[PDB]
Amino acid sequence: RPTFYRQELNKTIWEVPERYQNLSPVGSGAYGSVCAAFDTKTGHRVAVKKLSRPFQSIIHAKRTYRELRLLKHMKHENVIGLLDVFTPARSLEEFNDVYLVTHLMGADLNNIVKCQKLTDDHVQFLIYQILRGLKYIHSADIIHRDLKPSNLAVNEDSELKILDFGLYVATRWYRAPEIMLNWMHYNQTVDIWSVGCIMAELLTGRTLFPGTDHIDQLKLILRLVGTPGAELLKKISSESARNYIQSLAQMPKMNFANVFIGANPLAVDLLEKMLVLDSDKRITAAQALAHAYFAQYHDPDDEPVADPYDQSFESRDLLIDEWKSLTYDEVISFVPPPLDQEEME
Numbered sequence: 208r209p210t211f212y213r214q215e216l217n218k219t220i221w222e223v224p225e226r227y228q229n230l231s232p233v234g235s236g237a238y239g240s241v242c243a244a245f246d247t248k249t250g251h252r253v254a255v256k257k258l259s260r261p262f263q264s265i266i267h268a269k270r271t272y273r274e275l276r277l278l279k280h281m282k283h284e285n286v287i288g289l290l291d292v293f294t295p296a297r298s299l300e301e302f303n304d305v306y307l308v309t310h311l312m313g314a315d316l317n318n319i320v321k322c323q324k325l326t327d328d329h330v331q332f333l334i335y336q337i338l339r340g341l342k343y344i345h346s347a348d349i350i351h352r353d354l355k356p357s358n359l360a361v362n363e364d365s366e367l368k369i370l371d372f373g374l375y376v377a378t379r380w381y382r383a384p385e386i387m388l389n390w391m392h393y394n395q396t397v398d399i400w401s402v403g404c405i406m407a408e409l410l411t412g413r414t415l416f417p418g419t420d421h422i423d424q425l426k427l428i429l430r431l432v433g434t435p436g437a438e439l440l441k442k443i444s445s446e447s448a449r450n451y452i453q454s455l456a457q458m459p460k461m462n463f464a465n466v467f468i469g470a471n472p473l474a475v476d477l478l479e480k481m482l483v484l485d486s487d488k489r490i491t492a493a494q495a496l497a498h499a500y501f502a503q504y505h506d507p508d509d510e511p512v513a514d515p516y517d518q519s520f521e522s523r524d525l526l527i528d529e530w531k532s533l534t535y536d537e538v539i540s541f542v543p544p545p546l547d548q549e550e551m552e
């Protein structure tokens with residue numbers, strides 16, 4: 208049995224194995240808060256997320272199970288995955304706390320662009336990694352739906368991982384129009400719109416669509432991409448929303464070459480393929496990885512897809528204690544990955 212110790216962090220007691228030392232808070236995550244730590248078994252730096260009240264309600268209990276199942280499945284260099292999962296509980300009857308462990312990533316994408324004029328080669332690398340991660344999660348029928356710079360973890364060498372996928376006032380500036388406006392259908396390319404918004408901001412240093420509300424953001428979007436056709440209205444349930452959009456003065460699409468002056472023309476071309484209102488005509492992650500903009504990084508042998516992911520639990524309503532027992536089962540069955548899982552190409 209590992210010896211646990213207790214430490215008050217973020218005004219609450221954490222109980223963690225002696226293996227993990229020097230815990231220091233590094234912010235909140237989805238449904239929990241996060242500490243950096245030193246893993247004395249491997250000498251590696253890790254991030255430990257303590258889930259907040261994981262079994263307080265049917266909502267918390269199912270999302271705890273969902274997050275653990277998702278993170279146990281994610282095995283990709285550009286997607287947050289699990290090094291460890293632990294609980295101080297000695298049995299299911301005591302089980303009330305869940306801690307998730309991953310590699311430490313010191314920053315988010317906002318730390319990278321804030322005080323640094325990025326080079327085009329560096330922008331290519333950052334966006335390439337997002338797209339590689341999205342190809343992987345999308346291949347498992349997992350969509351992020353709220354991709355944005357604060358959901359991209361980055362380390363000291365600009366290596367990037369997507370987090371908080373497949374799951375307080377949030378920024379909406381990177382959300383796909385079909386998501387922000389609650390349209391009746393969408394596909395995995397909601398995340399590609401978000402990539403376009405992020406990439407645009409990495410190239411210009413300015414937020415692409417900094418709208419003050421739903422309607423102001425939509426107006427900024429339409430100024431760039433032009434007024435949509437009537438076929439777009441098909442997707443919008445609310446008559447007042449449809450009537451509003453229809454009543455707008457028509458706007459032509461802008462030439463993105465006039466918006467992103469001085470950018471690599473290949474970057475402009477990629478943006479034109481991402482920032483399209485018609486989600487059926489938006490480029491996919493796998494298609495974008497083949498785009499000439501990423502030629503110096505693209506490597507088809509190193510852009511893998513995911514193993515099939517069984518999401519049948521999503522349609523089921525179970526009792527709190529059933530989700531709790533399922534979660535306990537997933538904690539106990541977890542197999543830590545090898546420290547070194549990669550080989551020279």
Ligand SMILES: Nc1nccc(-c2c(-c3ccc(F)cc3)ncn2C2CCNCC2)n1
Binds near residue numbers: 233234256289308370
């Ligand atoms: N510093 C760092 N490094 C890696 C991940 C995180 C992390 C996690 C997280 C997820 C799963 C897990 F098992 C462990 C941690 N959730 C949110 N964040 C950060 C995301 C950027 N803002 C601060 C919190 N933070």
Ligand SMILES: N[C@]1(CO)[C@H]2C[C@@H]3C[C@@H](C[C@H]1C3)C2
Binds near residue numbers: 416427
């Ligand atoms: N952000 C910008 C330029 O500042 C605004 C004006 C126009 C349309 C959108 C996207 C670009 C170009 C909003």
Ligand SMILES: [Ca+2]
Binds near residue numbers: 506509552
């Ligand atoms: Ca390679």
Ligand SMILES: [Ca+2]
Binds near residue numbers: 547548549550
């Ligand atoms: Ca190796």
Ligand SMILES: [Ca+2]
């Ligand atoms: Ca490495």
Ligand SMILES: [Ca+2]
Binds near residue numbers: 508552
């Ligand atoms: Ca090869």
Ligand SMILES: [Cl-]
Binds near residue numbers: 280515516517
């Ligand atoms: Cl599975």
